[PDB]
């Protein structure tokens, strides 16, 4: 009774909140139900009690993503009474709702379309199951079709869409998806439908990024964790399922008088397989030790990674041109993992994980950096290095020092506050002072005026070579310590320096060749070759002043492909691309769009043309662009950027 | 229970207003929704679990009947 209560609480609540507010609302009932004396079990996890083993591997088998959220919302989305309302900003859950029910030959719309009214009689005709993916411009035609406002009349089970009237099919079910994941909906909508929140948090993405490396990584262990999984669902079933047929065995009661009561072997058998769950069981402790061991050593992995998405998702800020969607950082993970060279010749777990966490600081800064302005390389390579200075474990925070490093200019000085200080100019000396504040560098004064290399040191070419040791500590410092101690010294001392600077910081925490790639030239042949998707266009925005056709048509030349190139001027250019489009999908050439800066909303169409696309495992979409805002946020979002 | 668990629920949502999150509104309709959902789940869990006890309860005397057969 309690179990069921908490689960159809969770089912009909807590479809839109995120993990954190699930498991409090989970939390708040139970501790009201243990102060009422209602009995539930507590051992059960919420994702497991409403789901089947076989229902789960169908899921599995339709690329659900293993974050706990995502199962629950799976479980919402199997059983419900009011038609869900799918909240997936990221995208995977239109691809496991069409994976799931492809059988069932799933019908796309969406609500800005002419035709969906009429695919919705057909839906409503042949029961077969629908997904609108746009549903902000909502079209009410579904109220009586969310109110279920059925009429049974005769044989006929009937609804009244406008002034029609169309029969229903109880095989019918519709599935409403927004994209957006911050759109607000009147009262009758949350009312009308159920939420499936999907959008992918911190927690969520942490545990989808643990699951997937126990998954990729110790093969074997990860087959030690499906086996956890087995004595669950095989010999906990071998174990029912031998106790049911003994009981049968017996049930058969062959021999009347006759001592036929053979049974005894079926029961060691029972034994047997009673003692071995107790000691998967036990096992299972063990996992409290032993699989509980490999999920914490990529624990740091999963924590990175989602800093890492999250760090690019909020670079969406700093310019307009720095999009990337989950996808994108979900490739970077896969080419992390998997088809990743510097894993061929290493069996060992740790230095497989090592080497696994700097493949993926080095792929993702080289990916991110690719589509993003040359000003601004220092600045997300300083972030991954501040990542990093949080994922390793006997460094310290140093959150005063960058906190101080980041937000000196606000503290507010005075002109008695600065001593005045020979062979220092005024905005040094506020600088000096407001650094000296902090306790490593009280005594700072003192050393600057007892210093006699500072005068060589001030004025020299490259003074972040040199940093003189002024700072005073009890103890001796970390490498990265000392970069970022330096650091400070640089940008209070000589702040022209500090992005110079910057770099030798980098290089201290992320390796001295850390962004030694972006000096080469971008190698566009291994580019288009792997790693990026013949769907996901191949995005060239350059500044004004410079084109990038010529890098690409000899990309074509040297490898021997017959491209199509297209400007993009008035309407016959737009006939002229989507015709090239439509023969190089199939034939698999390569095509060309030249200044798609010029038409946004045929580039928003044709970003919804390539969504709904599977083309040939050659094709490649090449679309040159100038930096501006009116380029659409989707397609930067759904292409790979190129700077 | 279930009525605390409405309550709970807007007290939730409450809280997120004044956190400024986003908050989406709790209709009592949802309230008969869980109510249905409750009954689903019940009644399935129950169809089941009881079920399969019913022929637990079989076993139970067909123990007794082999203690006779044991008698005679």
Not at chain 1, 197 to 202: D, I, P, Q, S
Not at chain 1, 207 to 224: G, I, T
Not at chain 1, 304 to 319: D, G, R, V
Not at chain 1, 389 to 398: C, D, M, Q, R, S
Request: glycine share 4%; aromatic share 8%; hydrophobic share 40%.
């Amino acid at each position: 009774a309690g179990d069921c209560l908490l689960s159809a609480a969770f089912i009909a609540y807590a479809g839109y909140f995120d993990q954190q507010m699930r498991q409090n609302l989970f939390t708040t009932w139970s501790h009201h139900l243990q102060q009422a004396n209602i009995q539930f079990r507590t051992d059960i996890a919420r994702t497991e009690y409403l789901s089947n083993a076989d229902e789960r591997l169908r899921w599995q088998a339709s690329s659900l993503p293993a974050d706990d959220l995502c199962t629950e919302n799976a479980i919402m989305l199997k059983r419900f009474n009011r038609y869900p309302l799918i909240i997936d900003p990221s995208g995977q859950a239109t691809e496991f709702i069409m994976n799931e029910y492809k059988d069932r030959k799933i019908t796309r719309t969406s609500f800005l379309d002419d035709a969906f009214r009429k695919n919705l009689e057909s839906a409503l005709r042949f029961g077969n199951p629908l997904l609108v993916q746009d549903v902000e411009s909502y079209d009410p035609v579904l109220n009586p079709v969310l109110n279920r406002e059925v009429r049974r009349t005769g044989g006929r089970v009937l609804i009244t869409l406008g002034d029609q009237d169309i029969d229903l099919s109880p095989s019918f079910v519709i599935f409403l998806s927004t994209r957006d994941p911050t759109v607000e909906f009147p009262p009758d909508l949350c009312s009308r439908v159920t939420f499936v929140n999907f959008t992918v948090t911190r927690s969520s993405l942490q545990s989808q990024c643990l699951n997937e490396v126990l998954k990729a990584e110790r093969p074997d262990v990860d087959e030690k964790r499906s086996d956890l999984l087995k004595l669950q669902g095989e010999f906990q079933l071998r174990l029912r399922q031998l106790e049911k047929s003994l009981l049968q065995a017996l049930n058969e009661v062959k021999g009347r008088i006759l001592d036929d009561d053979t049974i005894i072997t079926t029961l060691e058998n029972l034994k047997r397989e009673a003692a071995e769950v107790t000691r998967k069981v036990e096992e299972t402790d063990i996992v409290m030790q032993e699989v509980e061991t490999v999920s914490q050593q990529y624990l740091p992995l999963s924590t990175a990674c989602s800093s890492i998405y999250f760090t690019m998702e909020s670079l969406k800020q700093i310019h307009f041109l720095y999009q990337y969607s989950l996808q994108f950082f979900l490739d970077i993970y896969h080419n992390v993992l998997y088809e990743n060279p510097n894993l061929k010749g290493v069996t060992d777990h740790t230095q497989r994980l090592s080497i696994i966490t700097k493949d993926l600081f080095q792929v993702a800064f080289n990916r991110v950096a690719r589509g993003m302005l040359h000003q601004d390389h220092i600045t997300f390579a300083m972030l991954l290095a501040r990542i990093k200075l949080k994922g390793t474990v006997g460094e310290p925070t140093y959150d005063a020092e960058f906190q101080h490093f980041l937000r000196g200019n606000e503290i507010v000085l005075s002109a008695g506050s600065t001593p005045r200080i020979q062979g220092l100019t005024v905005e040094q000396a506020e600088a000096v002072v407001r650094l000296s504040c902090l306790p490593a560098f009280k005594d700072l004064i003192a050393k600057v005026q007892a210093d006699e290399q500072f005068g060589i040191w001030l004025d020299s070419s490259s003074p972040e070579q040199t940093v003189p040791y002024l700072w005073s500590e009890e103890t001796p410092a970390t490498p990265i310590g000392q970069a970022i101690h330096r650091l400070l010294l640089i940008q209070a001392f000589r702040p022209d320096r500090l992005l110079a600077m910057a770099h030798m910081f980098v290089s201290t925490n992320l390796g001295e060749s850390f962004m030694s790639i972006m000096e080469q030239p971008l190698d566009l042949t291994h580019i288009v070759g792997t790693e990026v998707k013949p769907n996901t266009p191949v995005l060239m925005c350059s500044v004004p002043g410079y084109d990038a056709s010529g890098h690409v048509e000899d990309l074509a030349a040297e490898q021997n492909t017959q491209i199509t190139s297209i400007a993009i001027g008035s309407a016959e250019g737009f006939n002229q691309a989507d015709k090239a489009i439509n023969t190089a999908v199939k034939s698999g050439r390569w095509v060309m769009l030249k200044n798609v800066h010029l038409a946004p909303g045929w580039l928003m169409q044709l970003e919804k043309k390539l969504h709904s696309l599977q083309p040939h495992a050659c094709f490649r979409l090449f679309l040159t662009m100038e930096i501006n805002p009116k380029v659409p946020v989707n397609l930067l979002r759904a292409g790979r950027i190129f700077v | 229970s279930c009525v605390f668990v409405h309550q709970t629920l807007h007290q939730a949502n409450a809280r997120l207003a004044k956190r400024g999150g986003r908050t989406m509104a709790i209709t009592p309709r949802h309230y008969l929704d869980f109510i249905n959902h409750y009954a689903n789940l019940f009644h399935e869990k129950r169809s089941e679990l009881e079920e399969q006890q019913m022929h637990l309860n079989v076993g139970l005397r067909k123990i007794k009947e082999t203690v006779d057969q044991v008698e005679e």
